[PDB]
Amino acid sequence: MNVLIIGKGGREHTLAWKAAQSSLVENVFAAPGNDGMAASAQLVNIEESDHAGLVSFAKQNQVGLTIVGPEVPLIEGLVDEFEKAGLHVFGPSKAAAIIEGSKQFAKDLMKKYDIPTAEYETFTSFDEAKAYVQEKGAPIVIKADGLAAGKGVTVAMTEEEAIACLHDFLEDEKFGDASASVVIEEYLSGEEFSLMAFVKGEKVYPMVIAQDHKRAFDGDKGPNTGGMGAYSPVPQISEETVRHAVETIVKPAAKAMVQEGRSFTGVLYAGLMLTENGSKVIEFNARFGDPETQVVLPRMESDLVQVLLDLLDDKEVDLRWKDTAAVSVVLASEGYPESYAKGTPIGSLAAETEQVVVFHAGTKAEGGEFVTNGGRVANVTAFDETFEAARDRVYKAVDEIFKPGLFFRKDIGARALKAAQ
Ligand SMILES: Nc1ncnc2c1ncn2[C@@H]1O[C@H](COP(=O)(O)OP(=O)(O)O)[C@@H](O)[C@H]1O
Ligand SMILES: [Mg+2]
Ligand SMILES: [Mg+2]
Ligand SMILES: [Mg+2]
């Protein structure tokens, strides 16, 4: 079988990495992919907005299974297109991807279907939003409805902070139609973790959970990021905690989507907040998370390709997970999240430490080496029998392949490790 992974970041590398270990697969294509990915996936110069060249390529090159990595193509219906071409593909329809694409939709669905989440309202009028902020007071969370790039959530500690954001979103339309509408919801606290699951209709197959550092600098201070590293398992969250969110959140969400003419096949991502009231939904994503995938896929014992195939056909799925833990650290470019440097030489990026994989997020091959090719560059990930073992090993390799121009956090998984004792 030929498999087509789509996307260009660290998640897609892990996908190409895992698919390549599969015994069913003759060829793995990544489109576009990136240059660190090349031992795993024959790259393909079709960009991922290129739904037509992707469909055309896959149709003509006998792709038996396409996996779609990023959410925009899904939100914009790349899946529907492949199915029109008769192509076998893993991911949600444009109708299903709405569960991530419109946060209003997901807030409303959870409400309608009694799924635990922050209390909220959604606004299209700035005046009415502001009056609601002034009624509820701060803390309060201001969320753009549509994608907005990850940089469209503001946790406001003051009403002035909230009203400012409502001004950017609604009066200035910072994010266009993405911010044409706004979710305002209650501030929740606690441990945040990712619960991803393989979903098709009402069938849910949970994956092991992960946790990431969304914040730029150590001690979790600084602007937000797209992930500065993560790890799995999450020791300080019980096994019953997870089994419970699967039954009261994830399966109900899957079933809810079916019963709204929006049946969901793909990866459903529940980012969850374990509050003093129990687990609550911060948000759904409609695909593998980044960088959650880099620490979650390697722990899967099963063949992913076999797994997806049994899911798409409607057969018994045999999903087995490894006991080993994995921990991953992001090497980011100086300036990130804000304006960052492109072109920095960072060497071979290939550690000597064993039981390590560097998944490339932003990198180009140039000069026999790698240049920085993005805000977040690499995902030094390591595996081991227990958390802190793997945690110690990552930073070993972190300290091997590190080159000037990159930074990172030294405290990944540290707070979890402590609070786990
Ligand atoms: N209600 C909330 N209470 C506390 N923190 C929140 C809330 N909503 C979001 N956050 C924080 O903001 C981040 C981004 O919000 P999220 O809803 O997950 O949207 P995005 O798709 O942009 O990631 C989260 O990962 C979490 O750390
Ligand atoms: Mg998130
Ligand atoms: Mg999201
Ligand atoms: Mg079989």
UniProtKB/Swiss-Prot annotation:
EC numbers for this chain: 6.3.4.13
Which sites bind Mg(2+)? Answer: E283, N285
Q: Which SMART domains match?
A: GARS_A, GARS_C
What cofactor(s) does the depicted protein rely on? Mg(2+); Mn(2+)
Free-text remark on how the cofactor is bound: Binds 1 Mg(2+) or Mn(2+) ion per subunit.
Chemical reaction(s) catalysed: 5-phospho-beta-D-ribosylamine + glycine + ATP = N(1)-(5-phospho-beta-D-ribosyl)glycinamide + ADP + phosphate + H(+)
Pathway involvement of the protein, from the record: Purine metabolism; IMP biosynthesis via de novo pathway; N(1)-(5-phospho-D-ribosyl)glycinamide from 5-phospho-alpha-D-ribose 1-diphosphate: step 2/2
Alphabetized UniProt keyword annotations: ATP-binding, Ligase, Magnesium, Manganese, Metal-binding, Nucleotide-binding, Purine biosynthesis
Residues of the ATP-grasp domain: 107-313
Q: What class of enzyme is it?
A: ligase
One Gene Ontology BP term is:
'de novo' IMP biosynthetic process
* Annotated positions binding ATP: 133-194
Family matches, as SUPFAM superfamilies: Glutathione synthetase ATP-binding domain-like, PreATP-grasp domain, Rudiment single hybrid motif
List the Gene Ontology MF annotations in alphabetical order. Answer: ATP binding; metal ion binding; phosphoribosylamine-glycine ligase activity
Q: Give the family, as the similarity comment puts it.
A: Belongs to the GARS family.
Q: Which PANTHER family match?
A: PHOSPHORIBOSYLAMINE--GLYCINE LIGASE (PTHR43472), PHOSPHORIBOSYLAMINE--GLYCINE LIGASE, CHLOROPLASTIC (PTHR43472:SF1)
**What is the protein's given name?**
Phosphoribosylamine--glycine ligase
Species per Swiss-Prot/TrEMBL record = Bacillus subtilis (strain 168)
The gene for this chain is purD
